[PDB]
Design a protein around this ligand. Structure first.
Ligand SMILES: Nc1ncnc2c1ncn2[C@@H]1O[C@H](COP(=O)(O)OP(=O)(O)O)[C@@H](O)[C@H]1O
Ligand SMILES: Nc1ncnc2c1ncn2[C@@H]1O[C@H](COP(=O)(O)OP(=O)(O)O)[C@@H](O)[C@H]1O
Ligand code: NA
Ligand code: NA
Lengths: 170, 127, 168, 126
């Protein structure tokens, strides 16, 4: 067939991926992968505030996918996602997640992220504090916790549905 | 136990104790449930009830760690009830304990405290 | 962006392989079960016939628990007990369960020889060898071979990377 | 409850009831824990204690589904105690219920029963 398990394992090594999952993603699956992530961060002697940032970005990105799938009525079977967590050579963690979205939703999402990427930490805080009382707390929190600007991409399809992928560098 | 509130904690939700007679609301642990108002709805109701009449002080003793966005909104709703009662002359108080080696919890507690004008303490501990 | 593009390249590769689920990283007891639950939901959503749904589940659990057993035997901890697991569905409708892990090279070589020796035996010989291990391939590998519609396939790269593939 | 055995079921381990006075051992659910003897160790001891004592019949009523290799070994240890007691003249019996639409449970039960000479029933349900 087409399944090449060694080719994937080597691609994960090339990208320095420590954890990655693809498929239907449930509440309990989110938490259990987060538990593997927290153990890995502890085994790598992550500084306490760095460990919380990486975990927080993982939870919020993956819970945004859950929230979207609920809003669009998707079922357990339909609520699918691709999540990856890597660590750069300099020690910075990279948390990436992707999911299928309606095409109008995907285009409006990349706009909000492009509007988020260029704000400094003080502007991100103000927009965050204002959304406490269009990008919301989740994307704003991920942007605030990143050491690099948030990056997003969108692979459109004449299905009407697009693949949205987001990455944060912690 | 009738007027009290005892909620055991889990991996993704904090443990909560509402002591009605002592006027104390305590919470410990992480909080990242998918629908935080399934958890915090009864806590908000408990706070609103305590604050609706009487003059007894209400103090919040928090040992919370990571809160997701939904829990932060629910937490803000609780602190808005404290602030409203405090502007009306009700004595309220909050203490947030945290491990000194993790400044993100102190930074989160500080962001909450900038929207509050009641006594609000952040206490570091050497674990 | 380089990470978002690569995330897209991965998602497209999974599509070309008809992969339903795949995981890579440290694998614990609770992660085995939670991924197994996603598998059981997917099999129901695809209206898998009941004994076929149990065969795929049984092969998934036994493959991944063999990785757990090996990692414990070699003393590995939760951080070193790492694995790559994938479940696909071929064009013909048959499910494919593949799992891979790092092994000592001599262990991996003895493992490939053991799978090559069992893979080509018919169901009656697999049953007898199974029934004999009730009282070198054991009950785990023999059960996966017994439940497969095609001969078991194994490979070894270069600590070596061992990979096992069953078609149900 | 003193001589009885009640074990609640989980996602990967079966629920177990040992009724000492009725001479009945019941199980239900899947069984794929990583170390099955942490679970079945007390069940085997319960059976061994029951079979060393008295002449009262012991019946096993099983509603088991998926069993991993470790659980199958432990199950075979239990059936060897029944078979040992049965060869000595002790009345033992086993009944395995299963959903008629899933043959694999009956096929597994049938493989267990070829190593037994005591009454062993497999009952299909609609
Ligand atoms: N992964 C995603 N897929 C699709 N839409 C998303 C995703 N993440 C966020 N969104 C959309 O972007 C908006 C903002 O997200 P977020 O910052 O988490 O806001 P909030 O915290 O206020 O819910 C949501 O209203 C939703 O439409
Ligand atoms: N994924 C794996 N990695 C390394 N060794 C393995 C793996 N799977 C099986 N083995 C080896 O093959 C042997 C037999 O496997 P198995 O058929 O499960 O036997 P049993 O079920 O009797 O343990 C095990 O002792 C183990 O050393
Ligand atoms: Na959100
Ligand atoms: Na095994």
């Amino acid at each position: 067939e087409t399944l090449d398990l060694l080719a994937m394992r080597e691609s994960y090594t090339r990208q320095r991926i420590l954890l990655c999952f693809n498929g239907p993603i449930s509440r309990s699956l989110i938490e259990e992968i987060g538990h593997a992530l927290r153990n890995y961060l502890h085994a790598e002697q992550a500084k306490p505030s760095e460990a919380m940032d990486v975990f927080a970005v993982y939870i919020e990105m993956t819970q945004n996918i859950r929230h979207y799938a609920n809003l669009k009525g998707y079922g357990e079977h339909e609520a699918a996602a691709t999540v990856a967590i890597a660590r750069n050579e300099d020690g910075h963690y990279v948390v990436s997640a992707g999911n299928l979205v309606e095409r109008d939703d995907g285009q409006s999402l990349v706009r909000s992220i492009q509007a988020i990427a260029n704000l400094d930490k003080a502007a991100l805080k103000a927009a965050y504090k204002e959304q406490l009382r269009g990008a919301g707390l989740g994307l704003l929190d991920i942007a605030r916790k990143s050491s690099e600007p948030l990056a997003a991409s969108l692979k459109e399809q004449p299905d009407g549905r697009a693949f949205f992928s987001l990455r944060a560098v912690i | 136990s009738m007027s009290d509130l005892h909620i055991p904690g889990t991996q993704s939700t904090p443990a909560i104790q509402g002591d009605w007679q002592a006027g104390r609301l305590s919470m410990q642990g992480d909080s990242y449930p998918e629908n935080s108002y399934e958890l915090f709805g009864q806590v908000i109701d408990w706070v609103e009830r305590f604050l609706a009449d009487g003059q007894r002080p209400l103090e919040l003793d928090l040992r919370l760690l990571y809160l997701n966005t939904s829990s932060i909104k629910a937490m803000m709703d609780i602190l808005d009830l404290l602030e409203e009662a405090h502007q009306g002359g009700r004595p309220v108080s909050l203490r947030w304990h945290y491990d000194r080696r993790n400044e993100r919890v102190a930074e989160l507690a500080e962001e909450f405290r900038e929207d509050c004008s009641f006594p609000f303490a952040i206490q570091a501990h050497d674990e």
